[PDB]
């Protein structure tokens, strides 16, 4: 089939690649069970302004992205850097929630690389940003004559002056109040401080498996190693940036890694 | 010695290439494969493959 | 004054092991052979800059130095960082305290935290709100200056404070040699040994032979 013939002359003809399949999947994590306070993030009694947006950091918990994913009470859900369905499985270094109310005519300004009177002076967005923003109008929560909302490097709070209040009237469409919330996800190569609802699992060694140490993916023969990791060291590496030991996040230990044998298949005939 | 060193240098730069973005949002293929829905992973992985 | 930081202040850049490799980096560092303002804490602690990561240092047998008031203005109008070590632990704050004119200890605000021969190198840098403090507690032998010899630095702390911090001021137990280097974006070629310890680092923004290295 590979020579395009019916008569194969005497020789040695490479044909394929034998790469041992992995046996099974192995998932390790730190045994933590805190719930990230997503309630106050989305059920805050009073949202900040576009110039005084709050930045409250969450950590050391688990985040159920589905129970917020199904939220139809919100007007928009657009995730730039990552596919929001996989958030429930993705887990990363940190999060940052920023809540504030805007007018309906500004939701397009909130995007990585966009501009506008809001997107530049008082709320710049990062260019390499990875994450997403959620939003919803608040015609029945903020507008009553709501004029207590003002506007003037990204995420700088610069707290005839440019001070100016938004004229909010419950009878407005684009002139309606709109509550917005954005999240930032920095996928550094670091010990993740938050992870989604992923249950830890057992560990097996000396067998091609699918190891997932806090998100570090790959397959190999997880043999025990004597690499003296000084207690501040998390991963290992090699000459050319190849992970070559890790630390089991659920219980400290240092074990080697080697990708199990592959190699082309030659056919003699 | 020079022959051997030339070949080792070539191999080493070849393998080092794997850790470069070339314009992608990452160089760890599985991340793009575990972060983006296919409608965009197509673009990213395309850049990396090129 | 001014003194000659011979080869001081090489800290483990990130949390990743290596072994037997000469891995170059590009991070904040203390350049080689620089001028560290040897301060006379005999029998002082003026306001000093915190520009882009203050290599601090000291060499004190009794830790007279026990305060580190960092910030922009240090006047309780903006969130003012504060560090204290009281005989057992490290104490961190953010709250706005109206301090006196001279930072000294006798011999809205949302975050709190708790936890010669004593060479104690440092580095106090800020990156994306992640305040950092590295360290090394070390036995050495010199009262004069920052001697020859080489020893790396581990990490100790990280904090996501996001404070607008421009300058700072050490705070002593006012009833001693302590210095203040400064850091800027160099590029090192640091060498690891078999056990995984940085035994020898080489700057190359310094001079030609270093660039050939």
UniProtKB/Swiss-Prot annotation, chain B:
What protein name does the entry list?
Spike protein S2'
* Chain coiled-coil ranges: 1-45
Q: Which domain of life does the UniProt lineage start with? A: Viruses
* Gene name for this UniProt entry: S
Organism lineage: Viruses, Riboviria, Orthornavirae, Pisuviricota, Pisoniviricetes
Q: What is the annotated role of this protein in its UniProt record? A: Subunit of the fusion protein that is processed upon entry into the host cell. Mediates fusion of the virion and cellular membranes by functioning as a class I viral fusion protein. Contains a viral fusion peptide that is unmasked after S2 cleavage. This cleavage can occur at the cell membrane by host TMPRSS2 or during endocytosis by host CSTL. In either case, this triggers an extensive and irreversible conformational change that leads to fusion of the viral envelope with the cellular cytoplasmic membrane, releasing viral genomic RNA into the host cell cytoplasm.
């Amino acid at each position: 089939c590979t020579l395009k013939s019916f008569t194969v002359e005497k020789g040695i003809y490479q044909t394929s690649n034998f790469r041992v399949q992995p046996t099974e999947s192995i998932v390790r994590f730190p045994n933590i069970t805190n719930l990230c306070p997503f309630g106050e993030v989305f059920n805050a009694t009073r949202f900040a302004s576009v110039y005084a947006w709050n930045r409250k950091r969450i950590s050391n918990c688990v985040a159920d992205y589905s129970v917020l994913y199904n939220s139809a009470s919100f007007s928009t859900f657009k995730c730039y850097g990552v596919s929001p369905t996989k958030l429930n499985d993705l887990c990363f270094t940190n999060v940052y929630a920023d809540s504030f109310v805007i007018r309906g005519d500004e939701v397009r300004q909130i995007a990585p690389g966009q501009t506008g009177k809001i997107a530049d002076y008082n709320y710049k967005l990062p260019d390499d940003f990875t994450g997403c923003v959620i939003a919803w109008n608040s015609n029945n929560l903020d507008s009553k004559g709501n004029y207590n909302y003002l506007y003037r490097k990204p995420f700088e709070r610069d707290i005839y002056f440019p001070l100016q209040s938004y004229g909010f009237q419950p009878t407005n469409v684009g002139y309606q109040p709109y509550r917005v919330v954005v999240l930032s996800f920095e996928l550094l190569h670091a010990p993740a401080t938050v992870c989604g609802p992923k249950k830890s699992t057992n560990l097996v060694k000396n067998k091609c498996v699918n190891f997932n140490f806090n998100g570090l993916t790959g397959t190999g023969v997880l043999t025990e190693s004597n690499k003296k990791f000084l207690p501040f060291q998390q991963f290992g590496r090699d000459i050319a940036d190849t992970t070559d030991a890790v630390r089991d996040p659920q219980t400290l230990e240092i074990l080697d890694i080697t990708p199990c044998s592959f190699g082309g298949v030659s056919v003699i005939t | 010695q020079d022959v051997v060193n030339q070949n080792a240098q070539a191999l080493n730069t070849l393998v080092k290439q794997l850790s470069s973005n070339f314009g992608a949002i990452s160089s760890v293929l599985n991340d793009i494969l575990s972060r983006l829905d296919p409608p965009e992973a197509e673009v990213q992985i395309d850049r990396l493959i090129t | 004054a001014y003194t000659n930081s011979f080869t001081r202040g090489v800290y483990y850049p990130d949390k990743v092991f290596r072994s037997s490799v000469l891995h170059s980096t590009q991070d904040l560092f203390l350049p080689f052979f620089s001028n560290v303002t040897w301060f006379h804490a005999i029998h002082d602690n003026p306001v000093l800059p915190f520009n882009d990561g203050v290599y601090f240092a000291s060499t004190e047998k009794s830790n007279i130095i026990r305060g580190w008031i960092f910030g922009t203005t240090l006047d309780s109008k903006t969130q003012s960082l504060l560090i204290v070590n009281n005989a057992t632990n490290v104490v961190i704050k953010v709250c706005e305290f109206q301090f006196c004119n001279d930072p000294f200890l006798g011999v809205n605000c949302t975050f709190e935290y708790v936890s010669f021969k004593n060479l104690r190198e440092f580095v106090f840098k800020n990156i994306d709100g992640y305040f950092k403090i590295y360290s090394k507690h070390t036995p050495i032998n010199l009262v004069r200056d920052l001697p020859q010899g080489f020893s790396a630095l581990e990490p100790l702390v990280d904090l996501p404070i996001g404070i607008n911090i421009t300058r700072f001021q050490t705070l002593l137990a006012l009833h001693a040699a302590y210095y203040v280097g400064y850091l800027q974006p160099r590029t090192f070629l640091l060498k690891y040994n078999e056990n995984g310890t940085i035994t020898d680092a080489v700057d190359c923004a310094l001079d030609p032979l270093s660039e050939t290295k």
